[PDB]
Design a protein around this nucleic acid. Structure first.
Lengths: 136, 98, 176
RNA sequence: UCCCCCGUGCCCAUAGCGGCGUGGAACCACCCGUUCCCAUUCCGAACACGGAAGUGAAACGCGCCAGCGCCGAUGGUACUGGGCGGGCGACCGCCUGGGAGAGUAGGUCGGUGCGGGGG
RNA sequence: UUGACUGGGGCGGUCGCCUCCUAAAAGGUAACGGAGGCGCCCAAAGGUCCCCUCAGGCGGGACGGAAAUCCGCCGGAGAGC
RNA sequence: UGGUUCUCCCCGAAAUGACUUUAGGGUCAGCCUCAGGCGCUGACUGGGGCCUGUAGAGCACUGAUAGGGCUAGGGGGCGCCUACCAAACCCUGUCAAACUCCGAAGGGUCCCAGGUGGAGCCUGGGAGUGAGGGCGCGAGCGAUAACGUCCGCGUCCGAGCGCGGGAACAACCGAGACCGCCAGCUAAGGCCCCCAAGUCUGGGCUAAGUGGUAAAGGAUGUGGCGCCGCGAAGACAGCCAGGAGGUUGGCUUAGAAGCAGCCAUCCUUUAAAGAGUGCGUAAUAGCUCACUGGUCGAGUGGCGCCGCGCCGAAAAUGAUCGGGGC
């Protein structure tokens, strides 16, 4: 909700930023293919997330739209598009961890995310943890 | 703080860096671009009287001869906090003018 | 724990990676060497050992060095280690993260609400001769309210917390 | 030769901040005064002149400390001149040279020419 | 005589100059691509010499906002131009 | 706009910039050719010296950001209090063409060298071009549409619709055609026949005619590797038999007393342990193991990456991988 905007499409090269690590939560949802995820999609996932286990734990959505997706009105050529119209999106490079759950069973957690994946226009993978950290 | 550096505005080589203490005044001829000093004329770190101004002169005469001796003349004055006033080198010899 | 650490000569990191090895490096104010292990090896150890407990490497020539893993790198696409820097311990007081355990069950069940491991394990200055396995968290008397952090831990001897102190190390929050 | 100190330049934070004791014989400063020179939109605060009684408390100088700051490898990757495969495509990969940024180990409370005064 | 551009023409918009970006680490670089200015102003807002150093933040202060003016620390530039 | 007449030889473009009542026209520059003149200075390469601000990356400024912490202020009863509704501020995570603490490869230029080339440089005569196009890589516009559209570096076509391959086919792969030969070696791609040259020699995979070019998403389709159980505390499949007692605790009980729904997850006690996964109505009342003996005496259940394949798969004149046929 700010700054001067209606920006350049730009492209998604290798996913040099497609691969973080569960930061909070317990289990997670990492992306396999690069893409633009419409807020419309995030919610549509998150919602079903919470909704899968009514009155459950916590949901963390690390990805976040901010890129304005413009579009023409159904005509020809003459200056950038009315822009936005539908809205904004976030850019996901294969490997980024989109959503992550916690405070619940793996049977409940794992199965929860699985659904989300159906909402997102990508191919996903689910992860656990115990991996990366900065301890000794 | 005083960022004076009234100097720094010295481009024509040869600097007559002065320095007034609270009893003794020191003057010094320096070559920049090649950091080194040549002529020197302190106040009491020399000897002479005990009167600032009075001294401030006989202390400059010092630089005169001393300098001229090794082929020095045209130069520019100096010292930043200086405040061109009491302390003085109003003396013959050096073509530093003033 | 322990596991062979075969000396890295210095040729084709991928060659390893791909072959079966796992480039690494061991160092301290004194030592600094190129090493390599084996996925299945390192994994089987770290997966459980991580970097909370001591690791001793068996160099092909007698050597038996006390160490810890300061950092491991990942190949973004499909998390798989790429490199590893080993901290060859000795005696000087050293820094390191030590695990924490949240036992019991703080109020947060009637209406729900679950905690949030705000700092699974923390770093505290300590001398090697003493290296606590994991530390305890006597929290269970706080609801959606506040949370604990910094000096709210029975940090045993030689455990001068090495943080702020102020790092919120835990917190309980509402459900969905 | 090696110490101490007053001027100065250079490197341009590894010399910084903040702590901790020290130095007054010399230097330096603060001090002693406002008659003269000259002073502050009002103040000798600062500029300035004349004096040296008192002081090292300020300020500066010199040491020690790592808590902040600054520096910071090696490894390893990202990316990449050039060359080149796979797949329908979206994209993935190799060969040959180059090679960070972050982060780790760790380093640092300076270094160094010139001229002076003192043992 | 009743202009040109123009993802046909008309309608619409535009037409010179300045500044970012696009622009792919020398320059230069398109599109009816993204985004803003100019068609003036200073007789001091110009010379030179000599001085001073900001904005903020924190306390403390009669009237006094949440910055009127004062005093005290901190603040290398985020003010000014 | 159309037309422009004999022959051979040599070199050979351009479809860009600027200004144009200019936009299918023109002037100058750029690229071409000829003459003369200067002679190693050319392209490209090696070694040095600076310039740079992209790719990556990073939040130190500009902004944006999810969660927690702390906390001016601001709602709600109103003092205490209460969910980040929420300023700054600190963490944890991040994002950016018009952000940068940082920063490559690379590019530009100067010097010293290499480099005799249809290289260069100077002057002058003659031009044409100023309608490009495809492909690859980097970006805009588009819809991460177009044989779309604009630029940037390169290339090929243009002018190489001359030659080999790709079934056919300007620009994809190979390669720059003075001419002749019933000579040889090789490119690409090929070697079952049409159709030149292996039905060549090992080692594996696939049974769809896949190969013979469709996606999310699906399935004990196959073949090869891995980790967790756990099997004389000898069931993994038939199979016998109990199908335990306070369990029949919660709103709603009209009924939860698993076999309504939100609150439990203790106990008694052993065949063992259902805090009950399951066919129901009015609960309840019955059924099978989710546990255990007898024989039976052996590999069985649970997840996961890899190779190939399968479902997902509907269009119009007769069909087919170029065909035959594998």
């Amino acid at each position: 909700r700010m700054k001067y905007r209606k920006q350049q499409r730009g492209r998604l090269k290798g996913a040099t930023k497609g691969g973080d690590y569960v930061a909070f939560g317990d289990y997670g949802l990492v992306a396999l293919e690069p893409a633009w995820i419409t807020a419309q999609q995030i919610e549509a996932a998150r919602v079903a997330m919470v909704r899968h286990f009514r009155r459950g734990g916590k949901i963390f959505i690390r990805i976040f739209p901010d890129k304005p997706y413009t579009k023409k009105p159904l005509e020809v050529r003459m200056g950038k598009g009315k822009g936005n119209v539908e809205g904004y999106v976030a850019v996901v490079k294969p490997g980024r961890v989109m959503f992550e759950v916690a405070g619940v069973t793996e049977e409940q957690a794992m199965e929860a995310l699985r659904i989300a994946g159906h909402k997102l226009p990508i191919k996903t993978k689910i992860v656990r943890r115990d991996a990366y950290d900065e301890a000794q | 703080k005083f960022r004076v550096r009234n100097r720094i505005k010295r481009t024509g080589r040869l600097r007559l860096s002065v320095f007034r203490s609270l009893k003794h005044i020191y003057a010094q001829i320096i070559d920049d671009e090649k950091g080194v000093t040549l002529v020197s004329a302190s106040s009491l770190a020399l000897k002479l009287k005990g009167n600032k101004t009075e001294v401030a002169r006989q202390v400059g005469r010092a630089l005169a001869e001393k300098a001229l001796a090794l082929g020095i003349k045209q130069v520019a004055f100096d010292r930043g906090p200086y405040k061109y006033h009491g302390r003085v080198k109003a003396l013959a010899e050096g073509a530093r003018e003033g | 724990y322990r596991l062979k650490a075969y000396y890295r000569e210095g040729e084709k990191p991928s060659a390893l990676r791909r072959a079966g090895k796992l480039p690494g490096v061991m160092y301290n104010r004194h030592l600094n060497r190129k090493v390599y292990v084996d996925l299945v090896e390192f994994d089987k150890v770290f997966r459980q050992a991580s970097i909370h407990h001591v690791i001793v490497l068996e160099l092909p020539d007698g050597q038996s060095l006390p160490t810890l893993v300061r950092q491991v790198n990942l190949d973004k696409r499909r998390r798989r280690p790429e490199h590893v820097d080993f901290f060859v311990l000795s005696d000087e007081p050293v820094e390191m993260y030590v695990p924490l355990r949240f036992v019991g069950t703080p109020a947060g069940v009637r209406a729900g609400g679950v905690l949030q491991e705000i700092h699974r394990d923390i770093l505290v200055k300590v001398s090697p001769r003493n290296i606590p396995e994991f530390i305890e968290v006597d929290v269970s008397g706080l609801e959606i309210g506040d949370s604990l952090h910094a000096s709210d831990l029975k940090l045993p001897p030689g455990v001068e917390l090495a943080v702020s102190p102020e790092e919120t190390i835990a917190a309980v929050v509402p459900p969905e």
